[PDB]
Amino acid sequence: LLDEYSRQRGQITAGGQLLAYSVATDGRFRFLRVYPNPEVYAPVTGFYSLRYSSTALERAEDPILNGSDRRLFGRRLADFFTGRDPRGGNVDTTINPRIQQAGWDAMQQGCYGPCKGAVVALEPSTGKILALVSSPSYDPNLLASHNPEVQAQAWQRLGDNPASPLTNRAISETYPPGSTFKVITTAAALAAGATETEQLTAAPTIPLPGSTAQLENYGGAPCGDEPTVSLREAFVKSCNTAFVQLGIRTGADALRSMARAFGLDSPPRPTPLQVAESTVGPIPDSAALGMTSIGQKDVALTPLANAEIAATIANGGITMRPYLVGSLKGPDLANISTTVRYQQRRAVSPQVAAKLTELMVGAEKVAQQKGAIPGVQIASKTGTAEHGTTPPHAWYIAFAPAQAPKVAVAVLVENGADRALAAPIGRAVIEAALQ
């Protein structure tokens, strides 16, 4: 450890701003790692610690940041030959500081006090991760201390915190998607040949086949005041029974297949950070299928996966591979690597994506309007999700402008559902993006 602290570790950057850098000190270990906006960027930087090693981008891009990367070998030779103090390379992220800060701020004020959860912003046409927010977060300056006791105390406080602030909730945790998963049930039906004008039950209640279990609308009220409702109408008003009926009519295999087409049960590519796998679940019976259709049973998504669903629809049906690192530099600022955007797969036809967009623009209009942006059209799906064996989660997925999208977001507020919170958070992130 002594020698690797005698060489100046390189910088983690966002928008030409520093997220992590190293300062020359009088310490036995010469360089101290500094995080100037610590809690906000901790999901992106991770920590770099004498006692506890590294996480996130400190760990992923460790060869570049410490200067040991093969691609940096010439610079290291030239410096030693010339007498120059050596320095590691730089990692330039895809994070937009304005959007990251707006996601964080909105999370710290959006639950009459701080929310627990995650915000992800994506650029639909490129796959760039524009923001990666987790709350509560922690201060990596605490683990950068050269004092063993300060590090050990911080490590212990963090690990005993029931809110688990070390966890990057945007990419490492999976949550039931609830109402947001109607986007997938809808996509599956549209692809199988159903249309927006198709008629579905408006009944307040629906039996689940092969069980005494029963599903209901919110909170026992009929979708319309008519016998049935159109698919568009049930989508925009987020009726449950209609979708239980739609999904079972569509069948398990079509639902599974659309779920995989949208990245579920599909091993995620590193960003370079590892992303937990999302799942539609086994769907072992028809009771399960009705429950899967409205985002429950065994469906579990990372906030990132849910932002990608929105980004895929925004991008005309094509999924761009999400990435966090735009380019790697050497100590001179010479380009070592530039990331090139990659089309992962087509999930749905331009037609189905267009249809889903219309429905989502309708769902946004029906929704609570706090934080709406004048002259900007937003396509969205709000929702709640039940979990465990408890207050439901609050979700918002969206993209904007709906006509030619520049940004897609997912907002998850753990336990945030009322009986509103997620959507204004989403819209502040969008607004910051479109500035």
Ligand SMILES: *C(=O)[C@H]([C@@H](C)O)[C@H]1CC(SCCNC=N)=C(C(=O)O)N1
């Ligand atoms: C979706 O999962 C839920 C639940 C019944 O399963 C329903 C209830 C709500 S919450 C209302 C939030 N309004 C908006 N901004 C919705 C919905 O998102 O409309 N779906």
